[PDB]
Design a protein around this nucleic acid. Structure first.
Lengths: 71, 77, 69, 77, 71, 65, 76, 68
DNA sequence: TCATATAAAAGGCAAACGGAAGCATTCTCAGAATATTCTTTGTGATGATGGAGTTTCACTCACAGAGCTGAACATGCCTTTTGATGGAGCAGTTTCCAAATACACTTTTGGT
DNA sequence: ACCAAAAGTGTATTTGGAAACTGCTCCATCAAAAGGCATGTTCAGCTCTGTGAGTGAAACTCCATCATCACAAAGAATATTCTGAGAATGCTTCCGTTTGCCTTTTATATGA
């Protein structure tokens, strides 16, 4: 599936950069869910800003403003 | 910094979520904007793990458990 | 400013179905209106800033209202 | 197509709020934007007062005490 | 209680077909959501009843607590 | 016939922090539970017959609200 | 209600204004003092409830300093 | 002597309002420390808001703005 | 910048009431030992998939000019504003009983 | 099968719904007055629309390298249980601080 694009070794590598040592097998699905929620929020706000600018394409300004709004 | 998650799968996920769960019609994405989004997601995840492992080490467990992530998310806003 | 005076609020409630209005509600109405405007204006000005403009158009405020919920 | 809160005080309140939060030059306000803002604010206040009135009707006593409006907001929120 | 079958007596009416097999986690999530809905509605209704001065609940009060929010 | 029982209502209510419950509210609780279950099954049937799959339950039911 | 005595709170506010070393600047109102009391108590109760939740996650029903320390650190 | 005003049973009762069951002895010092840091932050913001205006008399509006 | 008044703010006294000391109590948490589990580590395949070079064409974007429109100001007059007594309906307070809820014992029964 | 659990029937308790009273504060109206809003002018910069130049985003093919599954092992860590001991609590008694209630006191808004 598309959501499984974020592969398990990628999550493990990201966790290693985060400083954790041992990772439980249940955390993969939870991390995918958290990433899904965060992406949903950010994409929704960025798309709303892009519709405001009345463009079909999304630009780095839209995403950075969406990030600024998110909190 | 160098990106951790490969750019193509994140691109696929972002494009599909935008075209489906935002009722947008075949929106086009700018590579710089997409890279900014990938950076934002990577930073958010690494920061969340940096926070959650503090709880894990606090609970005396050297490993990491999902309940730690749920609790850290609950505490953080 | 908070120039929204007593008869204005009383008439607003009167069209809102209220018959008798207490004297303690003017301050709370001013507060809730102030916070609601501080949210909507904030979002609308952020939107128009995103538009790389300086004036504000009804499109920006309607977008902000739609964003608020 | 009707309003019952005076245009100038609302307009000056909106302008001063916009200047207050955004520490930049005076954002010019298009005369349609203020009118639409007044429409929305009037509708929101009317709905809040309507819900507060329902609380009083269920409690018997009609006089709109601030506990009523704050409780209506709490349920709405 | 196996109230799940009594719940499905109305969905099978709409589907006009064999009742689909629902996972145990699906029934658990449905029950948890129902409990959350009931507790939220009851707490909201009790808040306004105690505001009215009563101590017990009533049909009119829970009906109002439902109608005040979105339907 | 009726799968909603008095202790089921009372345990959840006491979990909610209420003190006393009228006996006349059982019908209203049954009605609100009925409309809620109708809503969730309508969302579920919409999600199943709109998606290609039939036996599986769409977890997107959470995002309907 | 308010869970601490008013006068010690007033005097600590006075001395923590004195440490600003801007001469005489103490001008205290009952409404201001009670509002700051409520705000401080609310912040403390939020911190304690979160720290107790975290330490219950830890595996102990009691509370320890390292609970509130890291709770404050995580909050910001 | 300045921080002695915050008395130990106040911490216990406040934790009880916070849902805490038991309270260890060492918590009192860090509780007073976090109270001090929160007080100094909020009162720094309040005093700078009061200095923004020309009068040195504070108001309830200044502190509630300082909260934000 | 001076009069000044005045209303907010600093200062003192008795009560009681919450805080402090100290001791008896317990019981939670830290420590140790262990069965168990489940995560890691390594590695072969491997093919599954992500990264790199080419295109085109739809689009964004920088600019330029025209209009208008929003900021600022002058004027009349009318919805606001105080105050004013009344007054008068209405919110808060107290009693009572009675239906309705909580509680206890038993029996069907149905959930596992 | 079988045992927990809900229903039925009383039974004692209780709180809420109505009645009566009281004070209290909010609607209404009058007067006025006066402060603020609606209307009308004038100017300028800002938005809008267009117009073309550049460019980069979706689509494509191909290769190489990272995921992945599968395996076995292993041992690190986790969940579990048992034990004690310091600390956290409870209770009591005394005492030191707080708080209402007056009693000065002076920093600031108002006028000039």
């Amino acid at each position: 599936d598309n959501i499984q694009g974020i592969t398990k070794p990628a999550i493990r590598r990201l966790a290693r950069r985060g400083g954790v040592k041992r990772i439980s097998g249940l955390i993969y699905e939870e991390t995918r869910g958290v990433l899904k929620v965060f992406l949903e929020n950010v994409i929704r706000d960025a798309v709303t800003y892009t519709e405001h600018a009345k463009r079909k394409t999304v630009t780095a300004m839209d995403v950075v403003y969406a990030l600024k709004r998110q909190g | 910094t160098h990106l951790l998650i490969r750019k193509l799968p994140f691109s696929r996920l972002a494009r599909e979520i935008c075209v489906k769960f935002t009722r947008g019609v075949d929106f086009n994405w700018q590579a710089q904007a997409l890279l900014a989004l990938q950076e934002a997601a990577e930073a958010f995840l690494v920061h969340l793990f940096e926070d959650a492992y503090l709880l894990t080490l606090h609970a005396g467990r050297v490993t990491l458990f999902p309940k730690d992530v749920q609790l850290a998310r609950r505490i953080r806003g």
